Amino acid sequence: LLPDWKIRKEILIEPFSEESLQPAGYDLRVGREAFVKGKLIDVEKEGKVVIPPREYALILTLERIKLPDDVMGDMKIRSSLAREGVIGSFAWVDPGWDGNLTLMLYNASNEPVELRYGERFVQIAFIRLEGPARNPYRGNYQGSTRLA
Amino acid sequence: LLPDWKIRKEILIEPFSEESLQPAGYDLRVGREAFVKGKLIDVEKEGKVVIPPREYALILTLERIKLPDDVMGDMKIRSSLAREGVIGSFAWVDPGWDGNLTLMLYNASNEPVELRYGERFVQIAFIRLEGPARNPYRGNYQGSTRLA
Amino acid sequence: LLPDWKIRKEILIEPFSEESLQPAGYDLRVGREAFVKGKLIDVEKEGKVVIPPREYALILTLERIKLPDDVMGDMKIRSSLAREGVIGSFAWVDPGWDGNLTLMLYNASNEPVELRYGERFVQIAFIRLEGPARNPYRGNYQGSTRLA
């Protein structure tokens, strides 16, 4: 697992925010795109993304994450959102990945959960593989937008 | 964390599917058993398992996973399902585990989520322990069926 | 990742329960505080905490977890709860953390999920950082109570 000072040197995080740097992870921020109730949302334009109660939202990360072939992305919801009743349905960030992440966030609470554009909401930890993956990732690769 | 080429040599995955092999994990597939709305389902016979909207399903993995005493199973939903609004409630795969996994998948969306028999739905990563666990797992062990 | 025998020597777990020790993790137990339906609950006094169907609860862990600057806390719901339809919305346990954890647990089932005071419900795994985090955690730090 990469500590904070090693995250700067191993993972390409654009744009990078020093405040998003955690002791052993990086706080991914809300990007320009979102998907709530079957509608695409321009979080960059609208400025926010509101996850209605008991609804899930596909949120595009502001950061474009590029993982080396020997690093795995382990994402967890920011504790703030968890304490708000928000559940994150995160998959692995395969070694070699490159592009903005489409993160599923479910508002299990009865109050709407508002997420400002560029606000930190998911801390991604980076676990180093024992060796570079024989076959780096090649699926939703190079995604710069919300991918379904 | 075991890369793809090391997963072949350290973890017993039966049946094994080369397509389920990920850069740093293995895509567990839907097995023969499932549990939705208080009913047992024969996904092998019925061929599919449908998680109704806002309902959770206990799904038996097609693969029988046997973990060495120094490897921990880290499971995450397949991004495809996450983008569908499906949330996985996965526990740790203790070092030493052996048997098919009962995976809780919650359909947080408003559309039914269909999972074919043998379809990949959960990628399990394998983290190597600093040393073999003093007491390997002995609880729902050797489970070859859905375990409640 | 710390095996069971290394968890005793690296992580400060108070109070510690040998039964909560897993092959590669520790089963965190339900503490004295809980938060369900906008109300604070005295699980120590009341003895239990009931997560109503389709509701989430903020549960304070009985154990006060103190992580070294080079260890990350990876929490997952206990398989028992997962098989019950309970989903855990857990964030990272930053290296250096010290204090009781506020764990979000969502009852996705249609039956109430009862959690006795001191009952194990979340197994926390400990991943060692490649090096001590440059900036250990300093946010909801030293939390001995439910923190929102």
Ligand SMILES: O=c1ccn([C@H]2C[C@H](O)[C@@H](COP(=O)(O)O)O2)c(=O)[nH]1
């Ligand atoms: O919530 C997620 C999780 C992963 N990814 C990215 C990183 C991965 O390379 C890929 C998902 O494939 P898996 O690693 O989950 O198999 O897409 C996302 O965009 N959103």
Ligand SMILES: O=c1ccn([C@H]2C[C@H](O)[C@@H](COP(=O)(O)O)O2)c(=O)[nH]1
């Ligand atoms: O979603 C899961 C997670 C784990 N297991 C298996 C592997 C573990 O050995 C055991 C669960 O015990 P814990 O590791 O969660 O404590 O059952 C499952 O069947 N389904």
Ligand SMILES: O=c1ccn([C@H]2C[C@H](O)[C@@H](COP(=O)(O)O)O2)c(=O)[nH]1
């Ligand atoms: O579910 C959780 C997860 C984490 N923490 C603690 C440990 C962390 O130090 C901090 C949350 O900050 P992050 O690590 O999630 O960024 O609070 C909790 O109390 N509950």
